[PDB]
């Protein structure tokens, strides 16, 4: 049947059209435009705090808008809300499913979210009047493990799952209001735009997708990685983002030129990136690796600027504060470390 | 305010004492990752362990085990499997009577044994459905040499204790199937982790005790490696 053949050749036709269009705008490289900028030198950072109290590996960590409070998820069944200034434990939430892979802190501070291998996104109320932290709601409807979740406000949360689809929910009703499909692998990470009107996603197919939240469509697709994408994060202005993959490289993509802007890699690094994050200025790119430490990249010259080497096991998660003063790193050694 | 801070310290006291009460429970319970296939028969195994993801709790000699049959995920497993780099053991059930699919079991084993995050987890290998393999071998219509051409040059090993009233072709078949996994287990497992193969059927009642004994052995070897005695 010539239907599959003609669709194959149509797809190749317009795919190569997009290839040459992406090609018809690459006038230079980011390296040669930043060929004259000043290097940042050597970023020396030290472990200011070391957060202890988790029994098992830390898999996720979200930084509160307080720029002081943390939420951290460990695969022993504990959500620990944390005060980073005094290293005190504000809350310790026991979970029903031990195998949590993500956690989120509402931008208002009233609720946290967590979800893992149970396919459910649990939202917990932190600001109850009767004096307890109990399960506010359980969002069910994914057919795969939930790998990332992020609040847009205290009523809407976007969650990405292993079932290749993302979903924007309505927490008050508990009903999935939008489904974002198009990924052909496990979706691993989420990153919201500054205005939370778009969000970018990375999947286990070496592809990232830009989604419009309200309508529910995919705007742009980015390839260039060779293996699964484990972590995605936006640029502070929301006109670029960074992806970290199992192919031991990081890549900076632009939303307007629609092509990979830069690659951060080194021959001595042959382990996969587990987490990424940008500093408040966007001049530093933090990347956690499988070689047990984090690397601080000069995100404009791609030359590594520093190392955060204090963890005994795999570095799971990175987080930069809203004010940009601290960098939390979780790890499989069960310890959270703040760096400054 | 200088008063908020001591209330924070009091909340931290309560939280931390609860956390150390929960650490005794966490470190006294052993987590097992139950892997298999649609034909392997994990459901009947967990039916013997009376007492997104499913959990079963059983107790052997007052020791608690939590076995996690992941279940409701899609077929790709390279990402969520890493969530089990800390379990006591991976209980790997194989449908030994289905030769056409045995090569897909081996490969799965070969990838669990060689995965960077599972390269220290021991695998309790349950070769399930032995009565089916028995009747299939005695029927004669299905040749293991058709799927595995190295079965013609194989003989029942020395340390091979057969069941009473067992045909020797059955013994050759089951021990060849077991040694197919044991070769993978020995080619790369250098005392850091071991495979514990067991032949079981759907009516065996002593599977919980087998997992208990294999877990005891795993713990004892971990202790003997802490002291650098082995």
């Amino acid at each position, epitope marked *: 049947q010539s239907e599959l053949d003609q669709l194959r050749q149509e797809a190749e036709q317009l795919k190569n059209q997009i290839r040459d269009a992406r090609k018809a705008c690459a006038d230079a490289t980011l390296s040669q435009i930043t060929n004259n900028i000043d290097p940042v030198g050597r970023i020396q950072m030290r472990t200011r705090r070391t957060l202890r109290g988790h029994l098992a590996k830390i898999y996720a960590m979200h930084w509160g808008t307080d720029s002081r409070l943390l939420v951290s998820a460990s695969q022993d069944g504990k959500l620990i809300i944390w005060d980073s200034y005094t290293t005190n434990k504000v809350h310790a939430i026991p979970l029903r499913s031990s195998w949590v892979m993500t956690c989120a802190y509402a931008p208002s501070g009233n609720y946290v979210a967590c979800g893992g291998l149970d396919n459910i996104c649990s939202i917990y109320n932190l600001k109850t009047r009767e004096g307890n932290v109990r399960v506010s709601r359980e969002l069910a409807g994914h057919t795969g493990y939930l790998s990332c979740c992020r609040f847009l406000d205290d009523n809407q949360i976007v969650t990405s799952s292993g079932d290749t689809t993302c979903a924007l929910w309505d927490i008050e009703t508990g009903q999935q209001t939008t489904t974002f499909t198009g990924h*052909t*692998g496990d979706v691993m990470s989420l990153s919201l735009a500054p205005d939370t009107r778009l969000f970018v996603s990375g999947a*286990c*197919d*070496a592809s990232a997708k830009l989604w419009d939240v309200r309508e529910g469509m995919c705007r742009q697709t980015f*390839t*260039g990685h*060779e*293996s*699964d994408i484990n972590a995605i994060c936006f640029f502070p202005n929301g006109n670029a983002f960074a992806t970290g993959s*199992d*192919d*031991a490289t990081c890549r900076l993509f632009d939303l307007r030129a629609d092509q990979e802007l830069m690659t951060y890699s080194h021959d001595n690094i*042959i382990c*996969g990136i587990t987490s990424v994050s940008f500093s408040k200025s966007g001049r530093l790119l933090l990347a956690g690796y499988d070689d047990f430490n984090c690397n601080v990249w000069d995100a404009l010259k791609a030359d590594r600027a520093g190392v955060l080497a204090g963890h005994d096991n795999r570095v799971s998660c990175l987080g930069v504060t809203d004010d940009g003063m601290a960098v939390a790193t979780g790890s499989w050694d069960s310890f959270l470390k703040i760096w400054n | 305010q200088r008063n908020e801070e001591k209330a924070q310290r009091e909340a931290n006291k309560k939280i931390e004492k609860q956390l150390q009460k929960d650490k005794q429970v966490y470190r006294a319970t052993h987590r097992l990752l139950l892997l298999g296939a649609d034909n392997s028969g994990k459901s009947t195994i967990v039916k013997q362990m009376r007492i997104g993801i499913f959990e079963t709790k059983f107790q052997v000699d007052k020791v608690n085990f939590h076995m996690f049959d992941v279940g409701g995920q899609r*077929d*790709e*497993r*390279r990402k969520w*499997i890493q969530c089990f780099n800390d379990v006591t053991a991976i209980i790997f059930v194989v449908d030994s009577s289905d030769y056409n699919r045995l*090569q*897909e079991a081996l*490969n799965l084993f*070969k*990838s*669990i*044994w*060689n*995965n*960077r995050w599972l390269r220290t987890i021991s695998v309790i290998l349950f070769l399930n459905k032995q009565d089916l393999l028995a009747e299939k071998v005695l029927a004669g219509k299905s040749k293991i040499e*058709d*799927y*595995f*051409p*190295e079965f013609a040059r194989y003989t029942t090993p020395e340390d091979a204790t057969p069941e009473p009233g067992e045909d020797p072709r059955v013994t050759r078949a089951k021990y060849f199937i077991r040694d197919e996994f044991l070769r993978i287990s020995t080619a*790369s497992g250098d005392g850091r982790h071991y495979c514990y193969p067991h032949f079981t059927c759907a009516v065996d009642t002593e599977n919980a005790r087998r997992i208990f004994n294999d877990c005891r052995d795993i713990i004892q070897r971990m202790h003997l490696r802490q002291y650098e005695l082995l």
Partner: nanobody, 128 residues
């Protein structure tokens, strides 16, 4: 983009030979362990053969041992399967699969229903 295009395969009578080729692009070929998987009409994806990064280690499913020969050309980013004595039970779609991660000995999910780093497949119809 990661791309694996297969060539070869087609009509042969029992006892014939075929050279399946797999042109790779979008990644460093010398880093990944390569596989040949196949799906015969009416059943699921089954693993056929595999070869490591440099090419020393090589394995077969067993029903093809002695008949099929896997060989990689890293300098040409190509994978090859040579099949000498084709039986009727070899008619299938043949996919060239890549290992998920670039420096590992374990390759998960290569026989998955919608694995992302797999080719489209060549139809090998062996009939007389």
């Amino acid at each position: 983009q990661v791309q694996l295009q297969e060539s070869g395969g087609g009509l042969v009578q029992p006892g014939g030979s075929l050279r399946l080729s797999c042109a790779a692009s979008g990644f460093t070929f010398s880093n990944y362990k390569m596989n040949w998987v196949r799906q015969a009409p009416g059943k699921g994806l089954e693993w056929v053969s595999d070869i490591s990064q440099s090419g020393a280690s090589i394995s077969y499913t067993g029903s093809v041992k002695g008949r099929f020969t896997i060989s990689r050309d890293n300098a040409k980013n190509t994978l090859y399967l040579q099949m000498n004595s084709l039986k009727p039970e070899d008619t299938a779609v043949y996919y060239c699969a890549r290992c998920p991660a670039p420096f590992t000995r374990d390759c998960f999910d290569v026989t998955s229903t919608t694995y992302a780093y797999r080719g489209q497949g060549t139809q090998v119809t062996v009939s007389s």
